RNA sequence: CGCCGUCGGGCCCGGGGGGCCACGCGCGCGUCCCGGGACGGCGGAGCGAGCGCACGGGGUCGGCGGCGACGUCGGCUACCC
RNA sequence: GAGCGUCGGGCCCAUACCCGGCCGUCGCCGGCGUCGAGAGUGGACGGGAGCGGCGGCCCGCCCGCGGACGCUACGCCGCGACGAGUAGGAGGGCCGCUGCGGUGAGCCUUGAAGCCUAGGGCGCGGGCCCGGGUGGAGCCGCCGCAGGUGCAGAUCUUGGUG
C-alpha cells in the first residue's frame, strides 16, 4: 500500500544504516589490525636491542680487561620428568601449584627467591632451565592452549586473547609473547591464561630420568640446555 | 621374459618380548643389509602370493589357484635393513619364513 | 491448555507404539508419524492432516473447523482433491501458506501428499 | 590489459612491500499469449517450473569446506630425471619392462611413452609416471615434430551396449576388440619415421631397445644405477 | 588448530608482521648469497689467473 | 537392489565377537550369556593378559549408525496393515519386518501393501505355500 | 677533560642509495624547526564500485580412471581345522 | 668378549606421553525467532538551521504467489577436560519371568506356547527380533500395579546318566 511504499523510499535510508553498521566494524578491525602490525615492529626492534645489549656490554668489559656477569635470568621453563605413583607428601602439593599434575606437561615459572626454594623441594621430579626466545616463540604458537571459563581452547586467533586477556593491554598474540618473555608487571595473569603445555615424549630419548643433570643424567637444573630438550618434546 | 620383482623373506610380526602386535609385518629383505641402505624401498607394494583349492583371479582371464594378500612398506626397522610392511589384511603366520615379493611397481627413481 | 493436553498424552496414550525403535504417533489426524508436540493432531486447535481417498483416486485433506470446539462431529471439515499431481501439489500449498492456518508443518503436509499419490498412481 | 605486475619468489609472497605495491599501481592519483478466440490476454509462461513428486525424506546440504579443486583443474608435476628423450621402462603393463621411449608429458599428468613399434610390441601407448623408472640413457628428441592432434580425448576406451539387461554374447563390446587401428596406423608411422633416424645414431641402441628387463640373479635394485 | 610456523596465512591471522618478518629474511639471504658467488667467481678465477 | 536407503556410511563396530561368560566352554551348566564374574581371585575381573574380555562402554557403537541393518535401514516390527502404514512418511530410512506369528492368510496382504508404499520388508518371501 | 659503543633518545641539524600497513594541492587550527613538515581537531578533504580473479584462509573432493558371468562374487557368525 | 669397567652414536617397545577416530561420565552451555521476512553491544520524532547526494531550470515488495531439516522440552544441539577398582553406596535398563486393571478395532487350527537350529542379524551388555524344522491351542506388546521373580557353588534337596 501507500504506507509500505513510503517505507521503501525510506529503505534506501535503512540500508544506509545497514551499510554504516557493517562499515565501522570493518574499520575498527582494520585499524585494530594495523595496530598489531606496528607493535610487532616495536618488539622486533626491541628483542634485537635486548639481545645485542648483552653482547655489547660484555665486549666493552673484556676490552678493558674486566669480567661482565649477566643478570641471573628471571624466567625458567619447567617440564615434569617423573610420574604420579609414589609421591612424597611435600612434593604432592608443590607440583599442583606449578600446574604439573600429569607427566610431560609444563609451564613457565617466574623465577624469584620464593620460587627457587620450591624448585629444590621438587628437584627429582622436574627438569628446568632458562629458555631462549626461539623456544617461547614456538610454544605459544604451536602449543598455545588457553582456558576461558574452564575448557582449554586452542588459541587460533587474536580475538581470543583480546577478550580473555587484553584487560591490561595485551590484545594480540605477540603482546602475549613479550609479557611472557620479558617478565613485566602482568606476567601473573598471562601465565594463568595459558593451560599447561602438554608436550610429547622426547625424540632422542632421555638419560636415566632420576639423577641430577650434574650427574650426567637428566633431572634438575640445566640453564640453557633445556632449549636442547624443548626441540625434542615439541 | 624374466623376473620384475625383488625377493625378500618374511620374518615375523612387530612384536615385543611378551606381547605381539600382529597387524604389522617385518621383512628381512634380500640385498639390503643396512639401515642406511633402505632409503629406496620405502613405499613399495608387497604381495604375499599363496595357493588354495578354489579359484580367484585378476585380468589374466582364466580362474586360477593363485591368491594374493596385498600391502606396502612403511618404514625401516633396526639397523640391519629389516623393514616393516603393513598389509591390508594381516598375515596367516603360516608364512613365517616363506616369501613375499617386493615389487618395483611404485617407482621413485 | 493444549500443553496441558500434551503433558498428559505425551506418554500413556492409546495407539502409541514403542517397539524396537522410536515411538510412533499412529493418530487419526497427523502428517508425519512421530509422537511429538508439533506433529500431534488431537491437541491443537488448528490441525492439518491428509488421508487416502476411499473413492480410489485422489487425496483428501482434513482440517479442524476452529469455530466449535468440544463438538467432535462438526469439528472436522474435509475436502478431496483429485488433480494432475502438480496442481494438487500447489493447492495444498495455497491452503496452508496463504492463510495463518499452521504455517508450521507446511512441507510435512506436502511430503505425505507427495507420497500418497505415488502409492496410488500405479 | 596488464599482467600481474608482481613477480613471485616464495609461494604466496610478492617481491615488493605493501606500501611500494601501492605506488607501483600509481594509487596516489586514482582514488575513484492468446493464440485463439475467447481468451483473456497474455498467458505468462513459467520459466523453470515447479517439481511434482517430493521424495519423502530429504538430506541436508554439504558445508563447502574449501577450494578442493576437481581433477581437471589440479596441477601437473613430473620427476626431474624424466626429461623428453628418455628411454623409460614400463613396470606394470602387459608390456611390463620393455625399454620404451619417452616423448612428452600429456595434459593429464600421464606420459605418452612411445614404444618404437618396429622394435617392441609397444605402439604410442600411454603410461603413468610413477609406475615407470627413469633411465639415464638419452635420445635427442627436442628438434622432433610432434603431432598436434593427440591428447587425452584420443587415447581413451569407449563403451556401447544395445540392451540394458543380460543377453547371450559378452556385451558386444568386451568381446570384439578395438579397431581404431585403421586410423592409428598412420599416426604411428608418421612417428617412427621421424624417430628411428635418431635411434640409429647411438651405435648399440636399437638392440638395447629390442631387449627386455629382468632382475636376474644377484642384481638387487637400489645398487643398480639407471 | 592448523599449525603456525609450518604454513603461512595462519601466521598472518595471528601475526600480520610475519609477512614482513619473513620477506626480509628471503631478501637478506638471497642478496647475501649472491654477493658471495659474486666474490667466489672473482676469487676462484683470479686464483685461476694466479695459478 | 531392493530399495536403496539414504546416507548410511561404512559400518565399523569395534568388536564382532559377542562376549562370553568366563568358563562357558568348560561346562554346559554355564550358559553363554555374560554375567559379571565377582571372585576375589578371578583373573578376568583382574583383567590379566591372555584371558577373556569384560565389556565396558568403550565398545559403544557410533551414535550416527547405531542399530544398523547392513542395507542401511533400521528395523521396525509390525503385525497388520494399520501398523504398517505408519512408515508412509519415514520409509526410506526404516524398514518393516513381519512378525513370526502373522499367518500366510495375512502375510500375503502385508507384503502386498509394502509394495505400493515402497517400504523395505525384511522377511518378504517367508511362509509361502 | 676527552676516550670506547652495527649504543640508545623514531632526537634535532645543514647541505649533498636502499627502504617505509606512507599519499591534497588548492593554503590554515594549534605547537614545533629556521615557509615546509607532523598532527589531537577541521581549514585540506581519503572524488566507493567492490566489479572481478587467486587462494598454504573456519577438519577432502574429483565436473578422474580402470578390470571380471552362467560356477563363479561378496559375507558374517556359540561349524571345523 | 656374548665377562667386568669407563663411555659414544644408533636402534628396539608399555594400555604411559603427543596427535586423530569413537563411546560414556562430569562441568560449562545453547535453540519455544519454524522469523523467507526477522536482523537490536543503542533505537523514534515535527519541529529552528544545514551540507555529502538523489530530480536546478540557483525550487521530494511481489515477470515469478516462492524457500529444505528441526523442538518426545524427560526432545535436540554445541564446546571442553575426563575414565582403574575389592568391601560398599547410589543411578539409569525399550533386560527377563509371573499375576492384575488399562490399551493395542494387536495376534493366531491358513498353526499360539514351548523346544531344537553349520540359517540371517541387532545391542557394549543384560537379552531380543527374523528364517527353517518339530509340535497342535492359546499368546504377546505398550502405560500403570503386584511379586514366594533371575544360579555354578551351600560335604545343596530330590530326580537322572556316566
Ligand atoms: Mg615408582
Ligand atoms: Mg629414532
Ligand atoms: Mg635408558
Ligand atoms: Mg545346577
Ligand atoms: Mg585378591
Ligand atoms: Mg569405573
Ligand atoms: Mg514381550
Ligand atoms: Mg518377552
Ligand atoms: Mg507367586
Ligand atoms: Mg525365593
Ligand atoms: Mg557364586
Ligand atoms: Mg555341592
Ligand atoms: Mg557311578
From Swiss-Prot, chain A:
The modification Phosphothreonine is found at residue 3. Signal peptide: none annotated. InterPro entries: Ribo_uL30_ferredoxin-like_sf, Ribosomal_uL30, Ribosomal_uL30_CS, Ribosomal_uL30_euk, Ribosomal_uL30_euk_arc, Ribosomal_uL30_ferredoxin-like, Ribosomal_uL30_N_euk. The modification N6-acetyllysine is found at residue 110. One of its GO terms (molecular function) is mRNA binding. It is found in: Cytoplasm. Component of the large ribosomal subunit. Homodimer. Interacts with DHX33. Component of the large ribosomal subunit. The ribosome is a large ribonucleoprotein complex responsible for the synthesis of proteins in the cell. Binds to G-rich structures in 28S rRNA and in mRNAs. Plays a regulatory role in the translation apparatus; inhibits cell-free translation of mRNAs. This is Large ribosomal subunit protein uL30.
UniProtKB/Swiss-Prot annotation, chain B:
The keyword Ribosomal protein applies. One of its GO terms (molecular function) is structural constituent of ribosome. GO terms for biological process: cytoplasmic translation; ribosomal large subunit biogenesis; rRNA processing; translation. Keywords: Acetylation, Cytoplasm, Diamond-Blackfan anemia, Disease variant, Ribonucleoprotein, Ribosomal protein, RNA-binding, tRNA-binding. Its main location: cytoplasm. The modification N6-succinyllysine is found at residue 62. GO terms for cellular component: cytoplasm; cytosol; cytosolic large ribosomal subunit; cytosolic ribosome; extracellular exosome; membrane; synapse. SUPFAM superfamilies: Translation proteins. The modification N6-acetyllysine is found at residues 7, 62. Belongs to the eukaryotic ribosomal protein eL33 family. It is linked to Diamond-Blackfan anemia 5: A form of Diamond-Blackfan anemia, a congenital non-regenerative hypoplastic anemia that usually presents early in infancy. Diamond-Blackfan anemia is characterized by a moderate to severe macrocytic anemia, erythroblastopenia, and an increased risk of malignancy. 30 to 40% of Diamond-Blackfan anemia patients present with short stature and congenital anomalies, the most frequent being craniofacial (Pierre-Robin syndrome and cleft palate), thumb and urogenital anomalies. PANTHER family: 60S RIBOSOMAL PROTEIN L35A. Component of the large ribosomal subunit. The ribosome is a large ribonucleoprotein complex responsible for the synthesis of proteins in the cell. Required for the proliferation and viability of hematopoietic cells. This is Large ribosomal subunit protein eL33. The gene is RPL35A.
From Swiss-Prot, chain D:
This is Large ribosomal subunit protein eL6. Coiled coil: none annotated. PROSITE patterns: RIBOSOMAL_L6E (PS01170). It is found in: Cytoplasm, Cytosol; Cytoplasm; Rough endoplasmic reticulum. Keywords: Acetylation, Cytoplasm, Endoplasmic reticulum, Isopeptide bond, Phosphoprotein, Ribonucleoprotein, Ribosomal protein, Ubl conjugation. The modification N6-succinyllysine is found at residue 145. The gene is RPL6. Component of the large ribosomal subunit. The ribosome is a large ribonucleoprotein complex responsible for the synthesis of proteins in the cell. Gene3D superfamilies: 2.30.30.30. GO terms for molecular function: cadherin binding; DNA binding; RNA binding; structural constituent of ribosome. Signal peptide: none annotated. Its main location: cytoplasm. The modification Phosphoserine is found at residue 65. The keyword Phosphoprotein applies. Component of the large ribosomal subunit. May bind IPO9 with low affinity. Belongs to the eukaryotic ribosomal protein eL6 family. GO terms for cellular component: cytoplasm; cytoplasmic ribonucleoprotein granule; cytosol; cytosolic large ribosomal subunit; cytosolic ribosome; focal adhesion; membrane; nucleus. GO terms for biological process: cytoplasmic translation; regulation of DNA-templated transcription; translation. It comes from Homo sapiens (Human). The keyword rRNA-binding does not apply. The modification N6-acetyllysine is found at residue 177.
From Swiss-Prot, chain F:
The modification N6-succinyllysine is found at residue 49. One of its GO terms (molecular function) is RNA binding. CDD domains: Ribosomal_L32_L32e. Its main location: cytoplasm. GO terms for cellular component: cytoplasm; cytosol; cytosolic large ribosomal subunit; cytosolic ribosome; membrane. Component of the large ribosomal subunit. This is Large ribosomal subunit protein eL32. It comes from Homo sapiens (Human). The gene is RPL32.
Amino acid at each position: 500500500p501507500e504506507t509500505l511504499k513510503k517505507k521503501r523510499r525510506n529503505f534506501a535510508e535503512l540500508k544506509i544504516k545497514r551499510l554504516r553498521k557493517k562499515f565501522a566494524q570493518k574499520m575498527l578491525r582494520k585499524a585494530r589490525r594495523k595496530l598489531i602490525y606496528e607493535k610487532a615492529k616495536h618488539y622486533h626492534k626491541e628483542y634485537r636491542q635486548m639481545y645485542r645489549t648483552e653482547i655489547r656490554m660484555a665486549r666493552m668489559a673484556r676490552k678493558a680487561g674486566n669480567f661482565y656477569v649477566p643478570a641471573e635470568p628471571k624466567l625458567a621453563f619447567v617440564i615434569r620428568i617423573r610420574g604420579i605413583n609414589g609421591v612424597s607428601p611435600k612434593v604432592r602439593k608443590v607440583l599442583q601449584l606449578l600446574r604439573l599434575r600429569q607427566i610431560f606437561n609444563g609451564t613457565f615459572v617466574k623465577l624469584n627467591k620464593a620460587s627457587i626454594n620450591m624448585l629444590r623441594i621438587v628437584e627429582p621430579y622436574i627438569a628446568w632451565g632458562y629458555p631462549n626466545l626461539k623456544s617461547v616463540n614456538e610454544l605459544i604458537y604451536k602449543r598455545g592452549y588457553g582456558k576461558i571459563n574452564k575448557k582449554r581452547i586452542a588459541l587460533t586467533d587474536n580475538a581470543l586473547i583480546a577478550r580473555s586477556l587484553g584487560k591490561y593491554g595485551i590484545i594480540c598474540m605477540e603482546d602475549l609473547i613479550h609479557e611472557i618473555y620479558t617478565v613485566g608487571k602482568r606476567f601473573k595473569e598471562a601465565n594463568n591464561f595459558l593451560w599447561p603445555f602438554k608436550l610429547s615424549s622426547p625424540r632422542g630419548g632421555m638419560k636415566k630420568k632420576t639423577t641430577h643433570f650434574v650427574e650426567g643424567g637428566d633431572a634438575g637444573n640445566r640453564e640453557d640446555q633445556i632449549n636442547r630438550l624443548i626441540r625434542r618434546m615439541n | 621374459s624374466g623376473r620384475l620383482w625383488s625377493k625378500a623373506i618374511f620374518a615375523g610380526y612387530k612384536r615385543g618380548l611378551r606381547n605381539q602386535r600382529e597387524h604389522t609385518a617385518l621383512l628381512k629383505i634380500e640385498g639390503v643389509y643396512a639401515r642406511d641402505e633402505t632409503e629406496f624401498y620405502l613405499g613399495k607394494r608387497c604381495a604375499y602370493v599363496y595357493k588354495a583349492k578354489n579359484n580367484t583371479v585378476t585380468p589374466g582371464g582364466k580362474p586360477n589357484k593363485t591368491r594374493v594378500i596385498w600391502g606396502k612398506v612403511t618404514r625401516a626397522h633396526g639397523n640391519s635393513g629389516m623393514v616393516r610392511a603393513k598389509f591390508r589384511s594381516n598375515l596367516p603366520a603360516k608364512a613365517i619364513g616363506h616369501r613375499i615379493r617386493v615389487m618395483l611397481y611404485p617407482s621413485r627413481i | 491448555s493444549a500443553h496441558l493436553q500434551w503433558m498428559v498424552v505425551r506418554n500413556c496414550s492409546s495407539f502409541l507404539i514403542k517397539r524396537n525403535k522410536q515411538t510412533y504417533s499412529t493418530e487419526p489426524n497427523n502428517l508425519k508419524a512421530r509422537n511429538s508436540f508439533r506433529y500431534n493432531g488431537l491437541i491443537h486447535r488448528k490441525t492439518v492432516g491428509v488421508e487416502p481417498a476411499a473413492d480410489g483416486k485422489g487425496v483428501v485433506v482434513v482440517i479442524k473447523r476452529r469455530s466449535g470446539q468440544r463438538k467432535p462431529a462438526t469439528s472436522y471439515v474435509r475436502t478431496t482433491i483429485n488433480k494432475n499431481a502438480r496442481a494438487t501439489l500447489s493447492s495444498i500449498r495455497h491452503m496452508i501458506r496463504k492463510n495463518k492456518y499452521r504455517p508450521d508443518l507446511r512441507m510435512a503436509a506436502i511430503r505425505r501428499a507427495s507420497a500418497i499419490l505415488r502409492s496410488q498412481k500405479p | 590489459p596488464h599482467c600481474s605486475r608482481n613477480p613471485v619468489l616464495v609461494r604466496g609472497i610478492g617481491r615488493y612491500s605493501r606500501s611500494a605495491m601501492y605506488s607501483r599501481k600509481a594509487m596516489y592519483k586514482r582514488k575513484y499469449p492468446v493464440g485463439g478466440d475467447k481468451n483473456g490476454g497474455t498467458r505468462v509462461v513459467k520459466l523453470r517450473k515447479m517439481p511434482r513428486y517430493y521424495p519423502t525424506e530429504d538430506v541436508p546440504r554439504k558445508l563447502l569446506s574449501h577450494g578442493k579443486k576437481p581433477f581437471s583443474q589440479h596441477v601437473r608435476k613430473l620427476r626431474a630425471s624424466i626429461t623428453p628423450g628418455t628411454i623409460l621402462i614400463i613396470l606394470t603393463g602387459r608390456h611390463r619392462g620393455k625399454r620404451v621411449v619417452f616423448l612428452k608429458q600429456l595434459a593429464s599428468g600421464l606420459l605418452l611413452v612411445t614404444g618404437p613399434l618396429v622394435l617392441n610390441r609397444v605402439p604410442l601407448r600411454r603410461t603413468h609416471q610413477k609406475f615407470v623408472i627413469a633411465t639415464s640413457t638419452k635420445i635427442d628428441i627436442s628438434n622432433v615434430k610432434i603431432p598436434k592432434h593427440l591428447t587425452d580425448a584420443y587415447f581413451k576406451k569407449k563403451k556401447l551396449r544395445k540392451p540394458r539387461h543380460q543377453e547371450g554374447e559378452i556385451f558386444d563390446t568386451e568381446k570384439e576388440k578395438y579397431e581404431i587401428t585403421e586410423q592409428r596406423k598412420i599416426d604411428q608411422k608418421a612417428v617412427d619415421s621421424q624417430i628411428l633416424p635418431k635411434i640409429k645414431a647411438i651405435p648399440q641402441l636399437q638392440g638395447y631397445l629390442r631387449s627386455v628387463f629382468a632382475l636376474t640373479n644377484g642384481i638387487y635394485p637400489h645398487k643398480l644405477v639407471f | 588448530k592448523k599449525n603456525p610456523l609450518k604454513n603461512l596465512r595462519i601466521m598472518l591471522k595471528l601475526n600480520p608482521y610475519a609477512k614482513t618478518m619473513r620477506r626480509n629474511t628471503i631478501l637478506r639471504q638471497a642478496r647475501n648469497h649472491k654477493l658471495r658467488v659474486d666474490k667466489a667467481a672473482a676469487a676462484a678465477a683470479a686464483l685461476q689467473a694466479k695459478s | 537392489a531392493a530399495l536403496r536407503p539414504l546416507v548410511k556410511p561404512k559400518i565399523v563396530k569395534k568388536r564382532t565377537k559377542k562376549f562370553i561368560r568366563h568358563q562357558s566352554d568348560r561346562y554346559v551348566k554355564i550358559k553363554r550369556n555374560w554375567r559379571k564374574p565377582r571372585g576375589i581371585d578371578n583373573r578376568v575381573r583382574r583383567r590379566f593378559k591372555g584371558q577373556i574380555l569384560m565389556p565396558n562402554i568403550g565398545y559403544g557403537s557410533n551414535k550416527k549408525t547405531k542399530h544398523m541393518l547392513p542395507s542401511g535401514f533400521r528395523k521396525f516390527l509390525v503385525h497388520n496393515v494399520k501398523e504398517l502404514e505408519v512408515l508412509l512418511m519415514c520409509n526410506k530410512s526404516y524398514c518393516a519386518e513381519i512378525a513370526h506369528n502373522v499367518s500366510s492368510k495375512n502375510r500375503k496382504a502385508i507384503v502386498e501393501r509394502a509394495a505400493q508404499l515402497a517400504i523395505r520388508v525384511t522377511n518378504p518371501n517367508a511362509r509361502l505355500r
